[PDB]
Structures are given as structure tokens and as C-alpha cells.
Design a protein around this motif. Structure first.
Motif, short mmCIF file in Angstrom:
data_model
loop_
_atom_site.label_atom_id
_atom_site.label_comp_id
_atom_site.label_asym_id
_atom_site.label_seq_id
_atom_site.Cartn_x
_atom_site.Cartn_y
_atom_site.Cartn_z
N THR A 92 2.72 4.93 -6.93
CA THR A 92 2.52 6.38 -7.03
C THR A 92 3.27 6.97 -8.22
OG1 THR A 92 2.44 6.34 -4.60
CG2 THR A 92 2.79 8.48 -5.68
N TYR A 93 4.56 6.69 -8.33
CA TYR A 93 5.39 7.27 -9.38
C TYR A 93 5.25 6.56 -10.71
CZ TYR A 93 7.14 10.58 -5.99
OH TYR A 93 7.29 11.57 -5.03
N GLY A 94 4.57 5.43 -10.73
CA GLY A 94 4.07 4.81 -11.94
C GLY A 94 2.68 5.36 -12.34
N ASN A 95 2.27 6.50 -11.75
CA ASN A 95 1.03 7.20 -12.09
C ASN A 95 -0.20 6.38 -11.74
OD1 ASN A 95 2.38 9.60 -12.82
ND2 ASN A 95 2.81 8.71 -14.85
N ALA A 96 -0.20 5.79 -10.55
CA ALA A 96 -1.31 4.96 -10.10
C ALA A 96 -1.48 5.06 -8.59
CB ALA A 96 -1.02 3.50 -10.53
N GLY A 97 -2.54 4.43 -8.12
CA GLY A 97 -2.88 4.34 -6.72
C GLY A 97 -3.96 3.32 -6.54
N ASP A 138 5.16 -9.33 1.60
CA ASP A 138 5.36 -8.45 2.76
C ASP A 138 4.07 -8.35 3.59
OD1 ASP A 138 7.87 -7.94 1.57
OD2 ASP A 138 7.40 -5.78 1.26
N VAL A 139 2.94 -8.42 2.91
CA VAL A 139 1.62 -8.40 3.53
C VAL A 139 1.33 -9.75 4.21
CG1 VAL A 139 -0.86 -8.12 3.06
CG2 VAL A 139 0.82 -6.72 1.80
N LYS A 166 3.23 -5.12 6.17
CA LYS A 166 2.64 -4.14 5.27
C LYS A 166 1.21 -4.54 4.99
CE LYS A 166 7.10 -2.69 3.39
NZ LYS A 166 8.09 -3.04 2.17
N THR A 167 0.46 -3.63 4.37
CA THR A 167 -0.90 -3.91 3.87
C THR A 167 -0.88 -3.86 2.35
OG1 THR A 167 -1.73 -1.62 3.97
CG2 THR A 167 -1.98 -3.00 5.88
N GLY A 168 -1.96 -4.36 1.76
CA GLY A 168 -2.16 -4.41 0.33
C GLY A 168 -3.29 -3.50 -0.11
N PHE A 220 0.81 -1.23 0.00
CA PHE A 220 0.00 0.00 0.00
C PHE A 220 0.85 1.29 0.00
CE2 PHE A 220 -3.05 3.12 1.98
CZ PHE A 220 -4.08 2.95 1.08
N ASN A 221 1.95 1.28 0.67
CA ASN A 221 2.73 2.52 0.67
C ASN A 221 3.97 2.45 -0.23
OD1 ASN A 221 1.45 4.33 2.68
ND2 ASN A 221 1.56 2.46 3.91
#
Ligand SMILES: COc1ccc(C(=O)NCCCCCCCCO[C@@]2(C(=O)O)C[C@@H](O)[C@@H](O)[C@@H]([C@@H](CO)O[C@@]3(C(=O)O)C[C@@H](O)[C@@H](O)[C@@H]([C@H](O)CO)O3)O2)cc1
Ligand SMILES: Nc1ccn([C@@H]2O[C@H](COP(=O)(O)O)[C@@H](O)[C@H]2O)c(=O)n1
Ligand SMILES: O=C(O)[C@@]1(O)C[C@@H](O)[C@@H](O)[C@@H]([C@H](O)CO)O1
Ligand SMILES: [Cl-]
Length: 322
Positions: free
Chosen positions: A162-167, A194-195, A200-202, A156-157
């Protein structure tokens, strides 16, 4: 030589072997020393923002580091040091908004074709030897006998999204497209290790699975899972490039480093502009540029500058054991 602000970067064993030049620890509360020629940070992590601002005000270039694409036995989040780093003097591979050092390496076709034998050898070891970025997960257990579509979840973080123009919204769009475009298939949503480790979360915590849309929450090696699927959907995961190595069609909803070269089904609104900037590349040119030129390696036993082949051999040796 190179200034390092992050205590997490500074503790990487054999850091200077990756960078090919001396390194020194800098404090956020002191001026940049004259003996520092450049400042190294970790990609676009939040931790990089202050050193990047300091570098700009001091007149010093920034070098962006990250894990290599064949990194280690255990996960980075489990405290395992890296055997490979990427070193980027221009941008960073996952930032699609402007050229990275990797994009420029891919475009240097002649330098990549020179490495074709090394590329074929490493590609064969990775696929048939079932290697990946992380190398401790067991092989997926299944009957080897074309109706499974893989949808890749991420962390998730992570800044590659983000820098691949997504979320988060592109993850929903990706899943919906996989379902609608493959109505007779089973859709497998693979959760990131990692999740699975609890660190981490997904992007699919809220997903209500169904008979047709299934969660894969087993920690399994990518190439073994890819043998059982017919095509792969990603946002920006490294899994997408690994699926190309495995001979699978890949659809991209973000703009990762390996999109827009002519080898992927690109769904992003900025695809045409990015393809115009990148141009075309073959699979073996991408592989040589990324794994043999952009990634740097150390010897897992001596610490000295090394190569992919030595790291692969070591990781195979450690697996047999473990
Ligand atoms: C005076 O008032 C004052 C002074 C100072 C401050 C302030 O802001 N202090 C805090 C400064 C920043 C502290 C940074 C802690 C160390 C972080 O280490 C790294 C990093 O970001 O540099 C080291 C790297 O090698 C990585 O381990 C990264 C991690 C986390 O950022 O990045 C990832 C991760 O998310 O796990 C990114 C992944 O893509 C991957 O590379 C993994 C990796 O596999 C390891 O897990 O790292 O941390 C305020 C006020
Ligand atoms: N859902 C996922 C996504 C990534 N991965 C693993 O994590 C590595 C890095 O992928 P990301 O770019 O998605 O973080 C892959 O090479 C692969 O080993 C996985 O095994 N399952
Ligand atoms: O956390 C991140 O910023 C991300 C960047 C990706 O390119 C990749 O390194 C990813 C890790 O593989 C997560 O384990 O994290
Ligand atoms: Cl979003």
C-alpha cells in the motif's frame, strides 16, 4: 522515555535494547504522561492509527518500528521473537511518499563507505550462507545447470504494498509483464511463507496456472531459489533486494525502499519523481545503510545490544542443528 500502546510491541523481549532508551506501557484510555518523550508504533499497521492520533494531539513525535531485514529463525507469524528491529524517527522504509530515516541514511554516502568491509563480509555470508529475513526453510533442490523468471507474491494485508503505492492490481500487471517480456521462459510465481503456513493470504489465489506459468508453493530459502532464476519481478517485496545481492536483474512494479536508486528496472508511474528525490546509490551503500545502520540487533543468548555478524553466526549455528 518511549511510550508503547500496542501489547504486541510491549511483549517483544529486550524492546529497550533495540530502542536504546527506556520504554513504558501506555493505555489508550489515559492521557500521555509527561515522562514520555515519543510514542512508538508498528509501521503503518491499522493498530498504529489511534496512538498516532494521540501523539499528534499531545505534541509528541512518533517513532515507527518494524522487523529487521535479518529477523529470526522461524516466521514472525509463528510467535518467534525478533532478533532485529528497524527504528525510524522520520517515516518508515516502505512508505515511498516521503523520506524515511533509511532514505536519509542511504544518501549519507560517506557514512556507508566507512562500513564497506563489514558490508562485504555480511553480504558474502547472506548469499553464500543462504540467509534471509526468516531462516528455517530448507534449500531448494534442483539441478544447477537461463530460462526461468521469478515473480514474487506477497501478503495481502501488508502495508509495504500500500505505502509503496501499489495493491492487488499491480500484482496482475507484474505477472502479465513477466509473461509477455519473456515469451520463451518459464514463469515461476513464488508464494510467501506466511501464506504457505496458513496464516495469511496472497495476491494470486485466483491465478489459473499453466504449463508455462507455475506456482512455487514449497517453503525454500531465497538465495537457494535465486540461483536457479535469470531475473526477478516484484511489487515491493524484500525479495527484490535479496535478488540484487544474488546478482540478478530486478524489475519493480511498486516503490520499495531499494527502488529508484539506479539499480532496478522501475515500472511505477511515480518512478521519475522518486528517483529525483532519492538520487543514486551503490549496492554496498544500500546494504550498509539498511542492514548495518537502520537495523538494530540483540544478542540471541544474552539479550544485550549486538550486531548483524553475531546474529548471522547464531542463525547459522541453529540451522546446522535444526
Ligand atoms: C474504549 O473503547 C476501545 C478501546 C480500545 C479499542 C481498540 O482499538 N483496541 C485494540 C488496540 C490495538 C490492538 C493491537 C494488538 C497487538 C498488535 O501487535 C502488533 C502491532 O500491530 O502493534 C505488534 C507488532 O510487533 C506486530 O506483530 C504486529 C503485526 C500485526 O499488526 O504486524 C505484522 C503482521 O502483520 O504479522 C506486520 C509485518 O510487517 C511483520 O512485522 C509482522 C511480524 O513479523 C510478526 O508477525 O507483524 O502486531 C477500541 C475501543
Ligand atoms: N514470495 C516470497 C516473498 C517473501 N519471502 C520471504 O519473506 C521475506 C520478506 O519478504 P516480504 O517483504 O515479501 O514480506 C523475504 O526476505 C523472504 O525470506 C519468500 O520467501 N517468498
Ligand atoms: O504486514 C506488513 O505490513 C508487511 C510489511 C513488510 O515490509 C514486511 O514486514 C512484511 C512481512 O515480511 C510479512 O511476513 O509484512
Ligand atoms: Cl489495487
Amino acid at each position: 522515555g518511549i511510550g508503547i500502546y500496542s501489547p504486541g510491541i510491549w511483549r517483544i523481549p529486550h524492546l529497550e535494547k533495540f530502542l536504546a532508551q527506556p520504554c513504558q506501557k501506555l493505555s489508550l484510555l489515559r492521557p500521555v504522561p509527561q515522562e514520555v518523550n515519543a510514542i512508538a508504533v508498528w509501521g503503518h499497521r491499522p493498530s498504529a492509527a489511534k496512538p498516532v492520533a494521540i501523539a499528534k494531539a499531545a505534541g509528541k513525535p512518533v517513532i515507527r518500528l518494524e522487523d529487521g531485514f535479518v529477523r529470526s529463525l522461524d516466521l514472525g507469524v509463528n510467535g518467534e521473537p525478533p532478533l532485529s528491529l528497524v527504528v525510524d524517527d522520520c517515516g518508515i522504509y516502505y512508505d515511498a511518499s516521503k523520506p524515511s530515516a533509511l532514505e536519509k541514511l542511504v544518501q549519507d554516502k560517506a557514512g556507508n563507505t566507512a562500513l564497506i568491509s563489514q558490508a562485504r563480509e555480511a553480504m558474502h555470508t547472506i548469499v553464500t550462507g543462504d540467509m534471509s529475513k526468516y531462516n528455517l526453510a530448507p534449500a531448494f533442490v534442483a539441478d544447477e545447470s537461463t530460462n526461468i523468471v521469478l515473480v514474487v507474491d506477497q501478503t495481502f494485508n501488508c502495508m509495504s504494498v500500500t505505502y509503496g503505492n501499489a495493491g492487488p492490481h499491480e500484482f496482475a500487471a507484474m505477472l502479465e509483464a513477466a509473461m509477455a517480456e519473456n515469451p520463451q521462459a518459464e514463469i515461476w510465481v513464488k508464494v510467501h511463507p506466511d501464506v504457505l503456513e496458513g496464516k495469511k493470504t496472497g495476491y494470486f489465489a485466483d491465478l489459473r496456472a499453466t504449463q508455462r506459468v507455475r506456482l512455487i508453493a514449497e517453503n525454500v530459502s531465497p538465495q537457494s531459489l535465486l540461483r536457479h532464476v535469470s531475473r526477478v519481478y516484484v511489487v515491493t517485496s524484500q525479495y527484490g533486494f535479496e535478488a540484487l545481492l544474488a546478482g540478478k536483474p530486478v524489475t519493480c512494479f511498486g516503490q520499495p525502499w531499494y527502488a529508484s536508486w539506479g539499480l532496478t528496472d522501475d515500472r511505477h508511474p511515480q518512478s521519475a519523481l522518486l528517483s529525483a528525490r532519492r538520487g543514486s546509490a551503490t549496492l554496498e551503500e544500500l546494504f550498509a545503510a539498511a542492514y548495518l545502520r537502520y537495523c538494530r540487533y540483540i544478542d540471541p543468548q544474552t539479550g544485550e545490544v549486538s550486531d548483524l555478524f553475531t546474529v548471522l553466526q547464531w542463525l547459522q549455528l541453529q540451522r546446522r542443528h535444526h
